[PDB]
Each structure stands twice: as structure tokens, then as C-alpha cells.
A paper describes a structure:
Telomerase is a multicomponent, ribonucleoprotein enzyme that includes a catalytic telomerase reverse transcriptase (TERT) protein and a noncoding RNA molecule that serves as the template for synthesis of telomere DNA. Telomerase functions as a unique RT that uses a specialized, noncoding RNA as a template for telomere DNA synthesis. In highly proliferative tissues (e.g., during embryogenesis, germline and stem cells), telomerase, the enzyme that synthesizes telomere ends, is reactivated to extend telomere DNA to counterbalance telomere attrition. Although TERT contains additional domains, its catalytic core is structurally homologous to the RT domain of HIV-1.
In doing so, we have identified 5-methylcarboxyl-indolyl-2′-deoxyriboside 5′-triphosphate (5-MeCITP) as an inhibitor of telomerase activity. To identify the precise interactions that govern 5-MeCITP binding to telomerase, we crystalized the T. castaneum TERT-MeCITP complex along with a nucleotide hairpin that functionally mimics the telomerase RNA template-telomere DNA substrate. The structure of the complex refined to 2.8 Å identifies density corresponding to an unpolymerized 5-MeCITP residing in the active site of the enzyme. The triphosphate group of 5-MeCITP is coordinated by two metal ions in a manner that is structurally similar to that of a nonhydrolyzable nucleotide analog bound to the active site of other polymerases. The modified nucleobase of 5-MeCITP adopts a noncanonical configuration in which it is rotated 180° as compared with the expected orientation of a native dNTP forming Watson-Crick base pairs with the RNA template. This configuration is very likely governed by an inability to properly base pair with RNA combined with selective interactions formed between the methylcarboxyl moiety of 5-MeCITP and TERT. Specifically, the methylcarboxyl moiety occupies a hydrophobic patch formed between motifs 1, 2 of the fingers domain and T-motif in the TRBD. The positioning of the methylcarboxyl group of 5-MeCITP is coordinated by interactions with Ile187 and Ile196 of motifs 1 and 2 and with Leu141 of the T-motif of T. castaneum TERT. The unique positioning of the modified nucleotide coincides with a displacement of the nucleobase of the template away from its canonical position. The α-phosphate of 5-MeCITP is situated at a distance that is approximately 5 Å from the nucleophilic 3′-hydroxyl group of the terminal dATP of the ssDNA that is being extended and is therefore too far for nucleophilic attack and incorporation into the 3′ end of the DNA.
Author numbering: 1 to 596
The structure:
Amino acid sequence: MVHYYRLSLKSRQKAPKIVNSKYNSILNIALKNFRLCKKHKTKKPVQILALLQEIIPKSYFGTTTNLKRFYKVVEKILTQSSFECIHLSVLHKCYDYDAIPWLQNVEPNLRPKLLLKHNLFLLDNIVKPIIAFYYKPIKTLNGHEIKFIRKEEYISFESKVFHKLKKMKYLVEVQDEVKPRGVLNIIPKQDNFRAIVSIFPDSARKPFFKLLTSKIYKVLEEKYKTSGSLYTCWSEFTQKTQGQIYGIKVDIRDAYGNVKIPVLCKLIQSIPTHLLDSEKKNFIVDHISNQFVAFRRKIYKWNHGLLQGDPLSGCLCELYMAFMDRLYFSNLDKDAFIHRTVDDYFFCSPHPHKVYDFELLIKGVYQVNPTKTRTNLPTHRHPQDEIPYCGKIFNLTTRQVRTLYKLPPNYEIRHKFKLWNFNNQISDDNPARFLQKAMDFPFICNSFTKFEFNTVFNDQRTVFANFYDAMICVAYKFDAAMMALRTSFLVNDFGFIWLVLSSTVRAYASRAFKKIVTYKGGKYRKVTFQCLKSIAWRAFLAVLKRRTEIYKGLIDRIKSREKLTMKFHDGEVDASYFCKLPEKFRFVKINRKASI
Ligand SMILES: COC(=O)c1ccc2c(ccn2[C@@H]2C[C@H](O)[C@@H](COP(=O)(O)OP(=O)(O)OP(=O)(O)O)O2)c1
Ligand SMILES: [Mg+2]
Ligand SMILES: [Mg+2]
């Protein structure tokens, strides 16, 4: 009931020093070569595919077709996203079987599965290990993007921040050979770093930690400030505020690190016992004072605030921050806009001086991160009016809210979408259910909200732009699915994709219509299912025309048999934007070619 094979490097097994009776010994040439190359040292010019071509002799494949069928999957490994798989299928499907020299002497009909086992050995014992020898993979945290960084430079970088953490006092060796919470990982930021904990998977206390986060979130709700709700706050502020809106958003530097455990333990102790009893109070306090992690092999106590990656860190940081809000941010204009999430504050006032004062107050309380500040304050050199907060983009002048999309230059969009899941596999001969489960609406629901579809503060223009921008993300993940199909499912008839595509267009259009009807306001004019449907169709054509040397069939099918005419009951909404790719999507990389 396992159909997939995952591209992750942990799938690797320890390279045996010579293969045994079961396996053909043709590959021990390559097992020898893995050692002959690992006893090599280089410092700059390295191609991964090229050198693998020399560890594994061409004689294992015998021809030029089987070898490229193998190097497709090694390429996919090189360009992997986290939790991305291939079908075990691809390691035996449509091979030339009597062109290899070494199953020419085995049962003609038993070749598939033991060639599969052989290829499995190749990749698990040589391919992913040679990579893991030359590179570390790191998660960008931008989707499932994995960047490959040569371990030589990364060990150095890890060493420099370990330097900073022991040259400071943030990390003190305890050597109690004490059970550590988990393994410390250093992960690059931009020009910076981030120190994280990977918890040891010991699922005896996971429901306990969940009970605890639950309890103190209930404590947050009843004890601390009901923080309104972002949509409500923005709605009512923009309605009551006639004039030009001034605003600022600031990010607190090292939020988890600058929590003061003294103050935190006090706050924990102050909680009424009917909400958090004495034992769990003491466990939590002991827990946040006593945080041990393993790094290299020496054990270290973490002294710098709450430590990221720990299950209680989010809830305790919000407890601390709500306390700080009560202490320092209680006296601001009740007719002004204020909202916080975690380390991000968003303040707005028609009064410039009041926005200026809020910034001064914040910079007095916390150490802000200047890089991340966004404001139309005249005091700042480069005023913005679009400020990003909570994955939205609030326009201070127009009061419009657009979905914010994190898509850096030359970011491969396929890294946002988790096409495969190991726990629920799908066999190679059912592409329809795979496409379906990829087109399930959760992955885009977060840009289908009142924030996007209200006609209370947002124009009809803006609502429709939000819908089209969501359907672009949707069509992109549809194209990602199709790539997975053509290179793992290796599809025969594409008859199901027309039905899947029609179904998704119509269902997402229906959800959009219902959301828009639900949040009607003073700037509603009229919205139509025909218009929504054709917006979505245009969104799909916009994506598919970047490979219209593939999708010419589908392109022309939808243009021939579908309604795309764009008529609004408004003269305000520019339709030229609903025909091109939006400026945020037209440069995301769609080709999956082995970089380093
Ligand atoms: C590596 O995978 C993970 O498991 C993972 C990623 C991010 C995580 C956790 C746990 C908490 N978070 C982040 C904590 C951070 O504190 C906060 C705000 O993020 P941010 O402002 O961007 O970083 P921070 O303020 O500390 O420092 P900075 O401002 O750059 O100085 O959400 C686990
Ligand atoms: Mg921050
Ligand atoms: Mg932030």
C-alpha cells in the first residue's frame, strides 16, 4: 500500500561496504566508485549530475534512454520541495529490459520489481548520500522551497552564529547529560539567521502540551484584552475616518528572544487556579526556565527568551505580549486603529502626529526592526501607502485591501503546493483523484475572505481583482499538478482534466459569489456568476499560455466553448488587467532545471 518514494534525503540508508547475495554485483562497481569519489576534496567546480554519471557506470543501463529516465528522478531530487514524492513506478516503468546486460540472464517476467529494488539501492545508497556529502538542504520557509547550500560554507555559517551564541551568553553549556528538548538548528534568514528547536518526536506529552496551549489561550480570551477583530477594526475605522489616513506597521526584533522569562513566570503564576492549576503552572515555569537542546554533541541551556520551535512558545509569547499591550499601549486614541498579531503592530490615525507618537512609543518599548517598517509618515525617507499586514495589503489612501502574495524574483511557484502526501497515497493509475485532491479549496481559502470580497470598504474593482488574483494561484497549482502527472503518472488520456477543470472553475466562482453576497455594503453595484466564471477562465488561460506549446489544445478548447466576455455593471473596473498575467505572477519560474 506504499506507491510513492519520497525525494527527501533522510530516506537514505547507510552505504554497505559490499552488496550481498540478493543483489547483482554489477552495482558494486558503483559502490566502489562512491568511495573512490568520497575520498576526494574539491572547493569550487561541482556539477552533481555529471559526477554521479561517473560513479554509476553506463553499463548499469546499457543504453541512452534508460539512463535519462533515471536522471529525470535524480533531477527531481536536486530540485525537490519538502514532502514531494515520485511513484516507485518511475523506477521500472517503460524501461528497455533486454538492453541492460544484467537482467538478460534473469527470468524475463520477474525483471520489474528487482530492477526497482536495484534502482532503490542506487538512489538510497549512492545518489542522495553523494548529495548529502556535498550539500546541506535548508527550508526557505517560503512554501516548501528547499535551497541547496554547499555544506562547506554552511558549516562555517553555522559556526559563526554558534560563535555569536557562545560569545554572547544566549547559550550556556550545562553538561548535566540531561534529557534535551531537541536538536538546535541554525537556519539562514536573509543577511541574518534564525535559531530553532526540532523537538524529539516523543508523543507522550503532545496532547498534554496541546491541553496547556488550549488552557492559556482561554486565559488570554477571558483575562486579557479582547483584541476586537482585524476586519471589524479596519471596517469601522475606515468608515468613521473621512480624511487622509496615516499609518505605520512595525516588526519587533527577536520577539521570542526578548521575552523576559522573569516577567513571564510571574504572569504564569498570576493566573487564577480555576484556569491553570498549580501543577501545570509549575511545569510551565520549570519548562521555560529549563530549556536544554543538543547541538553538535554538547548540550546547552538556552537563556535568550522563549526559544523558537518549542510547542508552548507561541502561546506564552502572546501572553507576554498581551501583558505588554496592557502595560504600554492602553492610552491610545479610541477613535484610532490599532492591531497586533505577534511581533507586528499596525497603527493608523488621521492625525499624522499621533502616528508619529505611536512610532516613538513603540521604539521606546521595543527594539524595532527598521527594515520591516512600512508607513506614510512624512518623517520617513520613502513613504509607502500600501502597507502589508496579516498577509493583506492595506492601502492607506484608497482604504482597499488586497491579498499579499510572497513571490520573490525567480521563485519557482511549484514550491508553494504540496502535491503529495505520504499518509494518503494515490496509485499511479488514477490521475483523476490526484488532480481533484490538488484542486481542493483549502489551499486558497485564505484569499477567499471578507477582507477580499467585502464591498464595505473595498471597491468592485478591488473585489474582482482579488478573485482573479486568487484564481491565478489556483491555475498555477493546477499546472504544477499537470507537471506531476506528465512526469510521474505519465498520462495516457486527458479526458478527466476537462471535467475537473470545469468543476473547479464553477465551484470557486460559487464560493466567491456567496462570500461577496455575504459581505455586501455601500459600494456593491452588481456581481454576476457569468462574470466570476469568465474571470476564472481568463485566469486559467493567462497561466496556460506560458506553455502554449503544450496547452494549445486546452487553451483553444476553453476559448472555443466557453464564455469569457467581460461585462461589468460598472464603468470603474479596468478589464485590461483581467487579460494579462498580474505583475506579481508573470515572472515566477515554471521550469524545473537542476541548478546546483
Ligand atoms: C524553521 O521552521 C519552524 O519550525 C518555525 C518558523 C518560524 C517560527 C517557528 C516558531 C515561531 N516562529 C516565528 C517566531 C518568530 O519570532 C515569529 C516572528 O517572525 P519574525 O519577526 O519574521 O522573526 P523574529 O521577530 O524572531 O526576528 P526578526 O524580527 O527577524 O528579528 O514567528 C518555527
Ligand atoms: Mg519580528
Ligand atoms: Mg513579522
